[PDB]
Ligand binder design. Structure first.
Ligand code: GDP
Ligand code: CA
Ligand code: NA
Length: 166
């Protein structure tokens, strides 16, 4: 089968790791201690075609480092995650897109905008705002909760579809 290396980026505490664990292990974690070793592999079927997802979680890597750059050289598609209750994480998204464009040395990198923690009450970012930013990038936007599992499969599977159209 094809193997898809998907890299999850975003500000601290937005839920990169819980999203990854929810996808792979079908559990929601209340806390996650990152390592240098957190890649996760899982076989899934997307649109009738079996494939392998290799999820690389960037949690805990420094904002600018050789390891983070190596991680995104290896990635074929990217999830840019913010949290819908943290406006600053949504404002940081352009920084992660600029970083991916730099490392991949391209303006057309498979990417999906992910608005996580959609179960929480104190929303500060509208779906319309996020859709408008995704639209400016020409990429899909998906709303998720690693806790209720809403949108989790959709976000990773849509990213695979994005790779499959490149
Ligand atoms: N309610 C809620 N909490 C979440 C969600 N995603 C992550 N969290 C919590 O947010 C905190 C940070 O999550 P983590 O995955 O470690 O974020 P990361 O640093 O970006 O990898 C943890 O306490 C998680 O339990 C979500 O969708 N909903
Ligand atoms: Ca799962
Ligand atoms: Na954290």
């Amino acid at each position: 089968m094809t193997e898809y290396k998907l890299v999850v980026v975003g500000a601290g505490d937005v839920g990169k790791s819980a999203l990854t664990i929810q996808l792979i292990q079908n559990h929601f974690v209340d806390e996650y201690d990152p390592t240098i070793e957190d890649s996760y592999r899982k076989q899934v079927v997307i649109d009738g075609e079996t494939c392998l997802l290799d999820i690389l979680d960037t949690a805990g890597q420094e904002e600018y480092s050789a390891m983070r750059d190596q991680y995104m050289r290896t990635g074929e598609g990217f999830l840019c995650v913010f949290a819908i209750n943290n406006t600053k994480s949504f404002e940081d998204i352009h920084h992660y897109r600029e970083q991916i464009k730099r490392v991949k040395d391209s303006e057309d990198v498979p990417m999906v905008l992910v608005g996580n923690k959609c179960d929480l009450p104190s929303r500060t970012v509208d779906t319309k705002q996020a859709q408008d930013l995704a639209r400016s990038y020409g990429i899909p936007f998906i709303e998720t909760s690693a806790k209720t599992r809403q949108g989790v499969d959709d976000a990773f599977y849509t990213l695979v579809r994005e790779i499959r159209k490149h």
